[PDB]
Amino acid sequence: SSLPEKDIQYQLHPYTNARLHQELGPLIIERGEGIYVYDDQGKGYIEAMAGLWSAALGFSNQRLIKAAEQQFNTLPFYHLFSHKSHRPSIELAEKLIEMAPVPMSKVFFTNSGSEANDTVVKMVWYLNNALGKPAKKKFISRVNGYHGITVASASLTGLPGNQRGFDLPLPGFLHVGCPHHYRFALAGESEEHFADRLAVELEQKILAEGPETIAAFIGEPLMGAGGVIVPPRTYWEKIQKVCRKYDILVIADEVICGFGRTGQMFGSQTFGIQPDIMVLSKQLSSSYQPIAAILINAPVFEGIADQSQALGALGHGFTGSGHPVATAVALENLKIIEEESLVEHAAQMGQLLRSGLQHFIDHPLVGEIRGCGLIAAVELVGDRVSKAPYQALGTLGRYMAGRAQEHGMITRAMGDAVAFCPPLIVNEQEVGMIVERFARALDDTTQWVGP
Amino acid sequence: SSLPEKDIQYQLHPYTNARLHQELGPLIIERGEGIYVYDDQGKGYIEAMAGLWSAALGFSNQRLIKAAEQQFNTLPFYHLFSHKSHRPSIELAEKLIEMAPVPMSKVFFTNSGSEANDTVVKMVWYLNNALGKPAKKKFISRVNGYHGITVASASLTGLPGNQRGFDLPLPGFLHVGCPHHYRFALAGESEEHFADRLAVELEQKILAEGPETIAAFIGEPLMGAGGVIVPPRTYWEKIQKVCRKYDILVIADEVICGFGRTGQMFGSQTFGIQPDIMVLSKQLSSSYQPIAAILINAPVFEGIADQSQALGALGHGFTGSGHPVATAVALENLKIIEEESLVEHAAQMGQLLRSGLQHFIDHPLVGEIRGCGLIAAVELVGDRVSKAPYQALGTLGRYMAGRAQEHGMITRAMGDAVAFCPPLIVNEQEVGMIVERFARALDDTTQWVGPGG
Numbered sequence A: 001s002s003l004p005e006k007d008i009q010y011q012l013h014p015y016t017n018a019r020l021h022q023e024l025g026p027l028i029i030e031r032g033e034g035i036y037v038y039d040d041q042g043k044g045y046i047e048a049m050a051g052l053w054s055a056a057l058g059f060s061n062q063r064l065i066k067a068a069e070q071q072f073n074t075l076p077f078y079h080l081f082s083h084k085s086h087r088p089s090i091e092l093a094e095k096l097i098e099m100a101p102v103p104m105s106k107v108f109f110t111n112s113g114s115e116a117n118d119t120v121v122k123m124v125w126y127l128n129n130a131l132g133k134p135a136k137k138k139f140i141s142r143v144n145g146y147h148g149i150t151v152a153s154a155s156l157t158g159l160p161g162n163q164r165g166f167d168l169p170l171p172g173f174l175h176v177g178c179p180h181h182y183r184f185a186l187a188g189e190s191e192e193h194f195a196d197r198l199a200v201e202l203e204q205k206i207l208a209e210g211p212e213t214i215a216a217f218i219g220e221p222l223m224g225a226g227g228v229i230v231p232p233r234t235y236w237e238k239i240q241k242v243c244r245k246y247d248i249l250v251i252a253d254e255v256i257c258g259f260g261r262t263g264q265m266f267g268s269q270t271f272g273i274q275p276d277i278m279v280l281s282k283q284l285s286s287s288y289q290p291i292a293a294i295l296i297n298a299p300v301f302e303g304i305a306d307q308s309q310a311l312g313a314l315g316h317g318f319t320g321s322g323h324p325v326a327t328a329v330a331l332e333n334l335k336i337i338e339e340e341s342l343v344e345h346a347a348q349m350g351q352l353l354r355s356g357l358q359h360f361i362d363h364p365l366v367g368e369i370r371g372c373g374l375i376a377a378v379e380l381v382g383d384r385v386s387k388a389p390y391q392a393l394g395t396l397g398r399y400m401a402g403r404a405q406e407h408g409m410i411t412r413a414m415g416d417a418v419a420f421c422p423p424l425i426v427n428e429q430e431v432g433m434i435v436e437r438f439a440r441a442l443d444d445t446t447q448w449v450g451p
Numbered sequence B: 001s002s003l004p005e006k007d008i009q010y011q012l013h014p015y016t017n018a019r020l021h022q023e024l025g026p027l028i029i030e031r032g033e034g035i036y037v038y039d040d041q042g043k044g045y046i047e048a049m050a051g052l053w054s055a056a057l058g059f060s061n062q063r064l065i066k067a068a069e070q071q072f073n074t075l076p077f078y079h080l081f082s083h084k085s086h087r088p089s090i091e092l093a094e095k096l097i098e099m100a101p102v103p104m105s106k107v108f109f110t111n112s113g114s115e116a117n118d119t120v121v122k123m124v125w126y127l128n129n130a131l132g133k134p135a136k137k138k139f140i141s142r143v144n145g146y147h148g149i150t151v152a153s154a155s156l157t158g159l160p161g162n163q164r165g166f167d168l169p170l171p172g173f174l175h176v177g178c179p180h181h182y183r184f185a186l187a188g189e190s191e192e193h194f195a196d197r198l199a200v201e202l203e204q205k206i207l208a209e210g211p212e213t214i215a216a217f218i219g220e221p222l223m224g225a226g227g228v229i230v231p232p233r234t235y236w237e238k239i240q241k242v243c244r245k246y247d248i249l250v251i252a253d254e255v256i257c258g259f260g261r262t263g264q265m266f267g268s269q270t271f272g273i274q275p276d277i278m279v280l281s282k283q284l285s286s287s288y289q290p291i292a293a294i295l296i297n298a299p300v301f302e303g304i305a306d307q308s309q310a311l312g313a314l315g316h317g318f319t320g321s322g323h324p325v326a327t328a329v330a331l332e333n334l335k336i337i338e339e340e341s342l343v344e345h346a347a348q349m350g351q352l353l354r355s356g357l358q359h360f361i362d363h364p365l366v367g368e369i370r371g372c373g374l375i376a377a378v379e380l381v382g383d384r385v386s387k388a389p390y391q392a393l394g395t396l397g398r399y400m401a402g403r404a405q406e407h408g409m410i411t412r413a414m415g416d417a418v419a420f421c422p423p424l425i426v427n428e429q430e431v432g433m434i435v436e437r438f439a440r441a442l443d444d445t446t447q448w449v450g451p452g453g
């Protein structure tokens, strides 16, 4: 009958406890503008996550809306199968290739990040069969990495919450350590030496598995959903040397880091990664349309092209691959990010965010503050010396996130860390408000944990 | 540089020979209106495939475009994670549940058909773990079925072109026969007996694999990409009895059949299927937005809900799941289909299409004319008695499709069959034009072959 009642009756929600949902119902979000969303009671919230790490231009960018309209009225749907094409897919693909931080050869479009990583898995398998290396198939990823939730991409993902009860990972999807100094460094170990030990771990993993069986290493430049985990200094340098030593492809999952999130246009620039393949989504279209993109370099394309010829055609593609409305919106989105100098602006807003949060560095429940550019997290602990949680891992984060919402801010808990990933258009005072609302939530949480 | 040159330079095309693409370049489609698209030279074509079996309302429905606008200007993106919701997802889900041809409990949204089928795989695995049946995991599908192209959903798919080179199918993804009488029936075998033999095949497959290890059977009510293959009479009845005997879930992949394609609202109605899970996409939004929907019945939901509680939350969801613009467009799309009586209209347009094509039933190159509702195919052969192809399999289909395009019509060849899946809004005279353009293409193809006889 009521709208909340209909939701409970008819929707199975993602990333939601279904039974609790039947009791509590939804928080229905009705409208958005700038960095704000409003619920159906008219309460406004700063969307400090940009939705799902994604709405770079906020929730009422008229240029994107008009670009959708203009394309809708020209050609509202067509496809790229069997030599068919259309201008928006062509022009977007050109723009993505030309702005890539390393030389890239081709773009392949999907709807989601998960589909894109799933497609990259198939591409690498197809590639290595093309080349006559049928054993070179295994993927290496990392504990706490997030790469999506198809059967294959959830296998790449290294978060237990995405695997438990789903019979994952599949075989051939291997995991090395999470590069988080605060949690996994040895006592008195430096960042650089933590990085050394991670590179050794990767090489030993490869040697134990048989280097000839390892096709690819995939990683987010910095880990998003897994906690805003910034890798230790020299990690990417040392990891890439191990990969290049055994002819292992380096895949940068830029689904969150892409398009100005980390202080430069790509996480690959910020962290000195020269990937063979890049995966892009989210900020690509400010999530105004579902779209993702895979960039592959020359060797990857040439092997695939050779096979697609021998086997008649590339037996892969989604109905929505390169959708003309989604590609048109993404094209306009990238033009706005360039014309408005949002990469530079976000970097400056990020410095303000990070300096604001650092006033709480000696709070008794603050275990670590981390991030770079305009992405950050504050990890809470029940005890700073031991780094132990209050009650059980997740208890603090759950409480903090709930308090932040009460104070008009949407953040996301990742265990006991709360994340910040605001729209790139956030202004200085809005950053101040984000920090103030974080502060109030923290104060509430501290009184709740109590003496 | 020119637009075709940019395409060749920068895009890897799906379902395209990449090397041939570098030589020929693209056919760039510039605009659409009604049932027509126009290329960049201004030549018009009837889109007899509705794009990819999908654009129910044609290529310039203003109501859908305005519904997108109105939602863009309210809330252009949000998500459904962690109890968050929004009106368009809620109202769409209600509408889908209430119109379902069997009692259904919940809707889960994805972007694509492939994602939806991939998600259904995970849901079934999660479900059976929830129920304490950890061995009950394998899926059974069919030769020539199409269910998408993720690693898992390409394993469900039974077309060799989707598996060759990709190390698929994964283990646990099993295949029984294509239910196409014309190609796989024994000499002088009836439809009903062909159906018996297929049901026996399925039961033997289950028994050989261990019934306790089989979770689900999935099928398109009629097979789309694999050839517009109408199953033989009594197939679905007998297949479901085998499934119910061993407590195997029945999943109807309605990605093509959904929303009026086959003569009734759902392929499940047309063919008497009582599925536990339905998968919907394509006509859902006339492909104006990427969206797919999974309908799950009460037992499937209850088990999933039970576990999500014990494990804290359901560890699954796409950023675009239930996207407010895509759901708003699909909602308006389903309203138009109902208000304009397009299911009934498509049924009538389909009988005209079929009657038109049947004037060529005794043509020496026409092996079979099949379909129902407003989906059809004409399978061409080089020799009717042997059913053998002219030159290689595919030669006639490729030539026919090329001639159809020259005559202003886009059809898709599936080997030597050419498909018809026009927008539901096609009128009687447009059906006449589709059949005329098919006839000219067939006339060209006949002159090219020279059947003599």
Ligand SMILES: *Cc1c(COP(=O)(O)O)cnc(C)c1O
Pocket: A053, A111, A112, A113, A114, A115, A117, A146, A147, A148, A149, A220, A224, A225, A253, A254, A255, A256, A281, B317, B318, B319, B320
């Ligand atoms: C969100 C995300 C994905 C998956 O994207 P979907 O569109 O939600 O499937 C993949 N990789 C990373 C790093 C992500 O953050």
Ligand SMILES: *Cc1c(COP(=O)(O)O)cnc(C)c1O
Pocket: A317, A318, A319, A320, B111, B112, B113, B114, B115, B146, B147, B148, B149, B220, B224, B225, B253, B254, B255, B256, B281
């Ligand atoms: C087209 C199709 C799919 C896959 O849809 P995408 O949106 O292209 O992933 C799945 N099943 C059937 C029956 C289809 O026709």
